[PDB]
Amino acid sequence: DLDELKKEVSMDDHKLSLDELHNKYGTDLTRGLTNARAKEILARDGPNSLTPPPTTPEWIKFCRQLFGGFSILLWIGAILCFLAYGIQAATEDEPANDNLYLGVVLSTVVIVTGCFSYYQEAKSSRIMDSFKNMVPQQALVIRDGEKSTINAEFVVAGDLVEVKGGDRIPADLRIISAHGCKVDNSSLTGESEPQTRSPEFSSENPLETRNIAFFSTNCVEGTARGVVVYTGDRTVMGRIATLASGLEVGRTPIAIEIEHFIHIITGVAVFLGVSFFILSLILGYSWLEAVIFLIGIIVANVPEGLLATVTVCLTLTAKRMARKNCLVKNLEAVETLGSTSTICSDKTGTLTQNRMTVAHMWFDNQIHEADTTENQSGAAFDKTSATWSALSRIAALCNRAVFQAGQDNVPILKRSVAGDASESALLKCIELCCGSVQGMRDRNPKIVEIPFNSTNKYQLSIHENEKSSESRYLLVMKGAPERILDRCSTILLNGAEEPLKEDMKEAFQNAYLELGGLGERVLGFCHFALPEDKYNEGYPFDADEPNFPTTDLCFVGLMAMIDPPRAAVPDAVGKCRSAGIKVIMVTGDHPITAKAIAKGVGIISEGNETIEDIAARLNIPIGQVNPRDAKACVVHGSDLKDLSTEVLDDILHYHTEIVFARTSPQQKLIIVEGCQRQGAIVAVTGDGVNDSPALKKADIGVAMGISGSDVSKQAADMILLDDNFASIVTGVEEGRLIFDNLKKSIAYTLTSNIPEITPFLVFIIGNVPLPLGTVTILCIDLGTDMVPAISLAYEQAESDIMKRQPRNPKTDKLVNERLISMAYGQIGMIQALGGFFSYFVILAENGFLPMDLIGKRVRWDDRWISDVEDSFGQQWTYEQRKIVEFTCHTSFFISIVVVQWADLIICKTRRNSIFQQGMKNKILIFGLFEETALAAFLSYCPGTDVALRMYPLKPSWWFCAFPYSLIIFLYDEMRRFIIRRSPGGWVEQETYY
Amino acid sequence: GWKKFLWDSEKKEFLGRTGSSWFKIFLFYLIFYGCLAGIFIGTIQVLLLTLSDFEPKYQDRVAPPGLSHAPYAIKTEISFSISNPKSYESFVKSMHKLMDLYNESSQAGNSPFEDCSDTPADYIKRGDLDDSQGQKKACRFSRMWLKNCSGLDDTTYGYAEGKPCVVAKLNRIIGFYPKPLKNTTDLPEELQANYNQYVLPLRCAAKREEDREKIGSIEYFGLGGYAGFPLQYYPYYGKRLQKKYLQPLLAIQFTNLTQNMELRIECKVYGENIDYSEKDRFRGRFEVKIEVKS
Ligand SMILES: *[C@@H]1O[C@H](CO)[C@@H](O[C@@H]2O[C@H](CO)[C@@H](O[C@@H]3O[C@H](CO[C@H]4O[C@H](CO)[C@@H](O)[C@H](O)[C@@H]4O)[C@@H](O)[C@H](O[C@H]4O[C@H](CO)[C@@H](O)[C@H](O)[C@@H]4O[C@@H]4O[C@H](CO)[C@@H](O)[C@H](O)[C@H]4NC(C)=O)[C@@H]3O)[C@H](O)[C@H]2NC(C)=O)[C@H](O)[C@H]1NC(C)=O
Ligand SMILES: *[C@@H]1O[C@H](CO[C@@H]2O[C@@H](C)[C@@H](O)[C@@H](O)[C@@H]2O)[C@@H](O[C@@H]2O[C@H](CO)[C@@H](O[C@@H]3O[C@H](CO[C@H]4O[C@H](CO)[C@@H](O)[C@H](O)[C@@H]4O)[C@@H](O)[C@H](O[C@H]4O[C@H](CO)[C@@H](O)[C@H](O)[C@@H]4O)[C@@H]3O)[C@H](O)[C@H]2NC(C)=O)[C@H](O)[C@H]1NC(C)=O
Ligand SMILES: *[C@@H]1O[C@H](CO[C@@H]2O[C@@H](C)[C@@H](O)[C@@H](O)[C@@H]2O)[C@@H](O[C@@H]2O[C@H](CO)[C@@H](O[C@@H]3O[C@H](CO)[C@@H](O)[C@H](O[C@H]4O[C@H](CO)[C@@H](O)[C@H](O)[C@@H]4O)[C@@H]3O)[C@H](O)[C@H]2NC(C)=O)[C@H](O)[C@H]1NC(C)=O
Ligand SMILES: Nc1ncnc2c1ncn2[C@@H]1O[C@H](COP(=O)(O)OP(=O)(O)OP(=O)(O)O)[C@@H](O)[C@H]1O
Ligand SMILES: *[C@@H]1O[C@H](CO)[C@@H](O[C@@H]2O[C@H](CO)[C@@H](O)[C@H](O)[C@H]2NC(C)=O)[C@H](O)[C@H]1NC(C)=O
Ligand SMILES: CC(C)CCC[C@@H](C)[C@H]1CC[C@H]2[C@@H]3CC=C4C[C@@H](O)CC[C@]4(C)[C@H]3CC[C@]12C
Ligand SMILES: CC(C)CCC[C@@H](C)[C@H]1CC[C@H]2[C@@H]3CC=C4C[C@@H](O)CC[C@]4(C)[C@H]3CC[C@]12C
Ligand SMILES: CC(C)CCC[C@@H](C)[C@H]1CC[C@H]2[C@@H]3CC=C4C[C@@H](O)CC[C@]4(C)[C@H]3CC[C@]12C
Ligand SMILES: [K+]
Ligand SMILES: [K+]
Ligand SMILES: [K+]
């Protein structure tokens, strides 16, 4: 993959002839290649598909998951276990096999964690591969003189390939014959400009000539033929894809957060380890003892169960989102929504309901209102002028929608119509006050039609005229009122015709602004009678060249339609403004209407004003006012087509309420790329392929689900199933909610680390019998604490989350020093003291007073001293004192659970009190009950002294940790109180997580 | 980063805070930890109060007494050369440490020692476990009772010519009365002869059936010449109520020991309140691996 040969500017053989290219590829211009030759080349050059580059093999990524942070520590633990076993096997006879078992188990834990994480990512990958749901396609190749549609991967260099408006160019071709063919080079030129492909050559630059079709583009209109010059990774899109794909995606915020704490945890782990190992040999400890130490310290510091807890937590919230109509493709997108501060949404189908009914109509310099009520209980619109008849003919003819078969029973408004909502609303209005449209349509046969174009912005067609005395041709066209206004010279007034003097042009501008201010969408309709002398009844007007006069048409009148808004839309806009999310109305609707919809939805807050509004309120020119006195602004699409980068940066940097109208969804991407540049997370809402480059580069791409296409949804990160806008807010809220719970659970899990670390430290400084073994630790972090930490996710909100500003990534984190000061500094200390208390109590009741325990370790561990004098003078054998030490481990573990009760209760809420929030979380209650039942089972079950080394406890011991637990509860309760009374004080900037 | 987060000169910050932040945090932690320490100390003082000084509340983990010996074996093995003197020094040193506590000079006067029956006798109760009567009195145990293993004649105790000794001892338990097996038709073979009720018998043998032949003459020395412990040295009233108390001892000479070969000798005591354990190899019995390689 030579990058320099790929960095060079593309070269080609375009400047050639049709004869010079077939020889180069061995083909026929009228017969193409032969099947045998085609297969010979298919085997010579390879398939026409992106050759698999550095891909991750199944075993490679599985082996990768086996080596990562916690697994390396557990690996060194297994290694240490086998080292201690080897030492025992070579130094002593009858070596117990406890260490070999512990090592095999650690290795199993490492292998299984892997398996689980891999299974989850595989599940997501499968649901990710299941998105292409309609039907694939192929290319049209001509071999041996016959047309065949074969798998695109089977296309080779030299055969003949035919394309048709709507199909994708399967490879790089050399056009040989075209028929009004146009391509959309949006992938190389960055513009939605319909470039025409002609067989002739026109520019020295291959990207500018027309005799070459390029992979990754589509033929918008027309048909063409061509020879295949490039296929596979060699096509244009091939050099774009193979070298730009190598580019890494990145590391989502939650990943960076998980790394930051693995770094801190490892810091304290190595600090305690290397130091106590040097200390062990500075005090005369042998090698088989120091190895056991090292192991115990590594296990004590590492939270063997955290990461899996996080992975579960996140899976639970993903199921909740799949239940609230918002589906998330990538697990981490769950949090990206909360950290969002800029949204680029659309108006049709999100803020509005998309159901739609015609509302107002313009004709004979007079605004007319139509009945827009379900049961049709209102006022008619004076159906007595000829203008209205002509309007009915224009709308009823220049429309492709038709009622769905079998609706002869339902009413005219509630029936199903197959088509767009505009053509449907027009069809319903015509069928309402003009009778059966099916006969109105068969009464005028459509000869030639040119459908709506995103570029032409108009729909035209020439039908026959039902006139029995006028055997001429009728032409009708509808479209944007400005474009249609620019294409006329006469006005049908009360039936007769008149010129288009500026008087009616201004009346049309005021009428357009009137219907726009009403929040309605307006369309213009015009028609013209083609002279039968220049276009006889036999002449066929093929849709190829200018066969119809685009200008000099007869404008009849405007037609609006009331798509209404949604229930939560005003509330959603208010919620966004309250949080601080900059909303930007990007809509293909009209600014004249956009200003009305803006005032109606909230984008333009009641009080803000635009420069034109100020110039109108002060009846002065617009060039005099200062742009700083205008809070909002309406940016037109054409002025967007002619705008530089820095200008856009300043536009987004100086305005709080921007609205983009007459915008082609291409420009959208430009606005998105301008929003990310300033330093804010960006989300986007799309429906088609023009949004693909915008959803991919946005921090989070929200694609519609019902109306969206496979491409748009498969390329986005979050999919909506109801196409509503409130779902975006719900997604952000859930992203915050699952964050505060992670903080609580982390503090929980961490707090119990101190009571596990302190026994070992006192074991080395004070020389007392080991208080907490390693198996007991693993039984604490992997057992009793898992369920409570999992339950901490089901906690509801405390205050209003949808009201605070987004968290800063460079300053606010997930694990700061405040939490360390709480878990490692205060709560954990009390828990450790309680454990030591129960310890000393157990030893004092059996005969070993606290004064005689300091210094006994050397003999307490001596396996050959069968006479250890206690505080009373009794002689204790080795196994008897070991049994007592194990019972002390059991009681220490139970003390840990007792203090964990109050820790889980003080961790339930971070600020609020328990008597306010409430114990409505059933999972937490179940966690406490199970946490206690497990400890009792592990101690009282017979045969637990052979497996886990845990002896039964006497009913009076179980009450040695209770005072510490209640004290922890009271301390945290008073803590969460000064914060509420003193906002911004010491307790807040010191202990408020 | 590296340098700034360590010391900046504009905000006069060290590690991140100023002198007043570091001071507020240090003062808070000092008060917090001080309260923690005071509470732990109070909860430990109440613990010093809740127990009795003359008796352990729980005595179930030490019900079946153990059986220890005088030599200190690393792996319950006694291996030494009859030529190299620096081979059995670790044994004699221990043996001596144990017997050095039965010196007659230590046992002198009426207080607190009392002369007891030179022949095994019955129990002796010096009252209850109280402080009413002063320090109780314990019976005297003379060194000389052990005849050939006393370190008074042959300091080495035997190890010098291939005839080592092994001083066995019963683990001291408060209020424990040793009870021997009765004369009924059911009794081990060995125990039949010399059934002094007042003596707790101790008898050693070979772990395996083969080793029998390779083990010679087990000669036991004790109070009255019997191979046991006299019941008169019980019970034990505890350190607080009976300081300067001596527990009986039993010497065992393994005469006629085969040379250059590992011999497994298991010693065992017999009695009612005596029970062995398959897990603890020192509960009532004990094992020794003697090998006099010369
Ligand atoms: C257990 O521990 C004891 C030590 O406490 C240990 O050995 C006993 O040690 C003492 C003193 O060392 C022995 O007592 C006497 O030993 C005399 C030996 O000294 C003579 O020889 C040396 C040099 O060879 C001279 O310097 C010295 O001047 C002496 O001449 C011995 O002479 C004593 O008298 C015995 O012998 C005379 C005849 O010579 C006899 O008339 C006495 O009646 C007496 O008994 C007889 O001994 C012989 C010896 O084999 C015996 O065959 C005969 O049957 C005896 N006659 C009887 C019984 O009527 C006096 O013995 C003492 O004997 C040592 N052993 C014993 C068993 O008493 C033991 O070895 C340790 N035992 C074990 C199993 O570990
Ligand atoms: C309990 O009794 C122990 C033995 O008591 C002896 O016998 C009893 C029956 C009485 O007669 C009593 O009066 C006896 O003392 C007693 O231990 C003994 O303590 C003394 C004093 O330290 C030791 O004497 C010293 O001996 C060494 C060499 O010892 C060799 O033999 C022993 C084994 O016996 C080995 O362990 C050694 O390594 C040696 O191989 C002499 O070098 C040393 O010299 C000192 O004295 C001379 C004058 O004699 C001076 O010129 C020097 O400068 C030195 O100051 C002593 O002679 C005796 O060895 C030791 N016996 C044993 C068996 O260890 C013990 O202390 C008593 N304990 C209590 C609590 O009462
Ligand atoms: C503990 O127990 C033993 C054995 O007791 C015996 O067995 C028990 C299981 C139970 O059934 C007892 O009732 C039963 O006696 C005691 O030792 C035994 O003592 C007797 C009496 O001396 C011995 O019997 C003797 O056997 C000799 C040959 O083996 C024989 O020659 C003896 O003759 C004597 O008695 C006859 C009358 O029968 C008389 O004419 C003679 O002149 C002479 O006195 C006598 O029959 C047993 O052998 C002894 N058993 C053993 C194993 O040695 C033992 O004394 C007792 N200890 C205590 C402290 O009570
Ligand atoms: N099917 C249609 N046939 C004819 N005219 C249409 C049709 N759909 C939309 N129009 C008109 O052309 C304009 C361009 O539509 P476009 O899809 O770009 O945006 P939009 O429907 O207004 O929605 P959005 O808010 O998502 O941009 C519409 O505002 C409407 O005036
Ligand atoms: C001590 O053991 C020895 C054997 O090591 C016994 O003496 C042997 O007796 C046999 C006859 O049974 C003779 O053939 C050997 O020559 C003897 N060997 C020696 C070294 O004497 C001896 O009887 C045993 N003595 C005791 C008291 O057990
Ligand atoms: C075994 C005993 C004697 C060790 C006692 C160690 C104590 C004093 C240590 C353990 C953890 C430490 C605290 C942990 C976290 C922080 C937050 C940081 O931003 C400033 C330091 C500060 C405030 C530390 C101060 C000293 C501290 C409380
Ligand atoms: C409100 C606060 C200060 C009250 C704290 C009370 C403390 C001092 C109480 C609560 C529980 C008590 C201990 C609980 C259990 C045992 C075991 C029993 O076999 C003897 C008493 C003993 C050893 C108690 C001693 C005193 C103790 C620690
Ligand atoms: C509410 C909290 C902070 C109060 C804690 C009070 C602490 C500091 C008090 C409670 C009990 C007190 C101890 C209890 C017993 C003794 C033994 C006595 O012979 C001297 C005083 C001494 C050594 C006390 C020292 C101070 C002490 C530990
Ligand atoms: K841990
Ligand atoms: K994206
Ligand atoms: K933990």
Automatic annotation (TrEMBL), chain A:
<dbReference type="InterPro" id="IPR059000">
    <property type="entry name" value="ATPase_P-type_domA"/>
</dbReference>
<feature type="binding site">
    <location>
        <position position="587"/>
    </location>
    <ligand>
        <name>ATP 2</name>
    </ligand>
</feature>
<feature type="binding site">
    <location>
        <position position="478"/>
    </location>
    <ligand>
        <name>ATP 1</name>
    </ligand>
</feature>
<dbReference type="InterPro" id="IPR018303">
    <property type="entry name" value="ATPase_P-typ_P_site"/>
</dbReference>
<keyword id="KW-1003">Cell membrane</keyword>
<dbReference type="InterPro" id="IPR044492">
    <property type="entry name" value="P_typ_ATPase_HD_dom"/>
</dbReference>
<dbReference type="GO" id="GO:0030007">
    <property type="term" value="P:intracellular potassium ion homeostasis"/>
</dbReference>
<keyword id="KW-0813">Transport</keyword>
<keyword id="KW-0067">ATP-binding</keyword>
<keyword id="KW-0547">Nucleotide-binding</keyword>
<keyword id="KW-1278">Translocase</keyword>
<feature type="binding site">
    <location>
        <position position="348"/>
    </location>
    <ligand>
        <name>Mg(2+) 3</name>
    </ligand>
</feature>
<keyword id="KW-0630">Potassium</keyword>
<feature type="transmembrane region" description="Helical">
    <location>
        <begin position="261"/>
        <end position="285"/>
    </location>
</feature>
<keyword id="KW-0633">Potassium transport</keyword>
<feature type="region of interest" description="Disordered">
    <location>
        <begin position="186"/>
        <end position="205"/>
    </location>
</feature>
<dbReference type="InterPro" id="IPR023214">
    <property type="entry name" value="HAD_sf"/>
</dbReference>
<dbReference type="InterPro" id="IPR004014">
    <property type="entry name" value="ATPase_P-typ_cation-transptr_N"/>
</dbReference>
<feature type="binding site">
    <location>
        <position position="691"/>
    </location>
    <ligand>
        <name>Mg(2+) 3</name>
    </ligand>
</feature>
<dbReference type="GO" id="GO:0036376">
    <property type="term" value="P:sodium ion export across plasma membrane"/>
</dbReference>
<feature type="binding site">
    <location>
        <position position="588"/>
    </location>
    <ligand>
        <name>ATP 2</name>
    </ligand>
</feature>
<feature type="transmembrane region" description="Helical">
    <location>
        <begin position="883"/>
        <end position="902"/>
    </location>
</feature>
UniProtKB/TrEMBL annotation, chain B:
<dbReference type="InterPro" id="IPR038702">
    <property type="entry name" value="Na/K_ATPase_sub_beta_sf"/>
</dbReference>
<dbReference type="GO" id="GO:0006883">
    <property type="term" value="P:intracellular sodium ion homeostasis"/>
</dbReference>
<feature type="glycosylation site" description="N-linked (GlcNAc...) asparagine">
    <location>
        <position position="148"/>
    </location>
</feature>
<keyword id="KW-0813">Transport</keyword>
<dbReference type="Pfam" id="PF00287">
    <property type="entry name" value="Na_K-ATPase"/>
</dbReference>
<dbReference type="GO" id="GO:0030007">
    <property type="term" value="P:intracellular potassium ion homeostasis"/>
</dbReference>
<dbReference type="GO" id="GO:1990573">
    <property type="term" value="P:potassium ion import across plasma membrane"/>
</dbReference>
<comment type="function">
    <text>This is the non-catalytic component of the active enzyme, which catalyzes the hydrolysis of ATP coupled with the exchange of Na(+) and K(+) ions across the plasma membrane.</text>
</comment>
<keyword id="KW-0812">Transmembrane</keyword>
<keyword id="KW-0630">Potassium</keyword>
<keyword id="KW-1015">Disulfide bond</keyword>
<protein>
    <recommendedName>
        <fullName>Sodium/potassium-transporting ATPase subunit beta</fullName>
    </recommendedName>
</protein>
<keyword id="KW-0325">Glycoprotein</keyword>
<keyword id="KW-0739">Sodium transport</keyword>
<feature type="disulfide bond">
    <location>
        <begin position="204"/>
        <end position="267"/>
    </location>
</feature>
<keyword id="KW-0735">Signal-anchor</keyword>
<keyword id="KW-1133">Transmembrane helix</keyword>
<feature type="disulfide bond">
    <location>
        <begin position="116"/>
        <end position="139"/>
    </location>
</feature>
<keyword id="KW-0633">Potassium transport</keyword>
<dbReference type="GO" id="GO:0001671">
    <property type="term" value="F:ATPase activator activity"/>
</dbReference>
<keyword id="KW-0915">Sodium</keyword>
<dbReference type="GO" id="GO:0036376">
    <property type="term" value="P:sodium ion export across plasma membrane"/>
</dbReference>
